[PDB]
Amino acid sequence: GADNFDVVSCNKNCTSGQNECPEGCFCGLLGQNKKGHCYKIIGNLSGEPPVVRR
C-alpha cells in the first residue's frame, strides 16, 4: 500500500546527526547536505461528508 502514503512537512529545520526531529518525523536531506527539514508520512482517509456539526 505504498501508493496510499504521502510525505508532508513536520514544520521544523534539522541537521543530520542531531536527534532534532519530533518523534514520528524524519530529517530529510538532499544528497550530502548537513541541513534539511523535518517530514512525516501520512495517509489520507477519504469519504468525509462535506459538513460536520459537533
Residue numbers in the entry: 13 to 66
The authors write:
Ticks draw blood for days to weeks without eliciting inflammation, and investigation of saliva of the brown dog tick Rhipicephalus sanguineus revealed the presence of chemokine-binding proteins. These proteins, referred to as evasins, suppress chemokine-driven inflammation by binding and neutralizing multiple chemokines. Evasins 1 and 4 (EVA1 and EVA4) are homologous, with eight conserved Cys residues, and specifically bind subsets of CC-chemokines, whereas EVA3 has six Cys residues and specifically binds a subset of ELR+ CXC-chemokines. Members of the first class, which includes the class founder EVA3, bind one or more ELR+ CXC-chemokines, including CXCL1 and/or CXCL8, but not ELR− chemokines.
EVA3 was expressed and purified from Escherichia coli and crystallized readily. The crystal structure of the nonglycosylated EVA3 contains two molecules per asymmetric unit, monomer A (Gly13–Arg66) and monomer B (Asp12–Asn56). The two monomers are very similar, and the Cα of residues 13–56 can be overlaid with a root-mean-square deviation of 1.0 Å. Residues Leu57 to the C-terminal Arg66 are not visible in monomer B and are only visible in monomer A because of an extensive β-sheet interaction of this region of the protein with a symmetry-related monomer. The EVA3 monomer is composed essentially of a single domain containing a large antiparallel β-sheet composed of residues Phe17–Thr27 (β1) and residues Lys47–Gly55 (β3), with residues Phe38–Gly40 forming a third short additional strand (β2) interacting with residues His49–Tyr51 of β3. Two extensive loop regions, composed of residues Ser28–Cys37 and Leu41–Lys47 join the two major β-strands, whereas a very short α-helix is present at the N-terminal region residues Ala14–Asn16. The short β2 strand, which interacts with β3, is held in place by a disulfide bridge between residues Cys26 and Cys39. The first loop, between strands β1 and β2, is rigidified by the presence of two other disulfide bridges between Cys33 and Cys50 and Cys37 and Cys22. The topology of EVA3 is that of an archetypal knottin cystine knot, with the Cys3–Cys6 disulfide bond (Cys33–Cys50 in EVA3) traversing the macrocycle created by Cys1–Cys4 (Cys22–Cys37 in EVA3) and Cys2–Cys5 (Cys26–Cys39 in EVA3) disulfide bonds. The crystal structure also contains a cadmium ion present in the crystallization solution that binds to the side-chain oxygen atoms of Glu60, carbonyl oxygen of Leu57, and carbonyl of Gly36 of the symmetry-related chain A molecule.
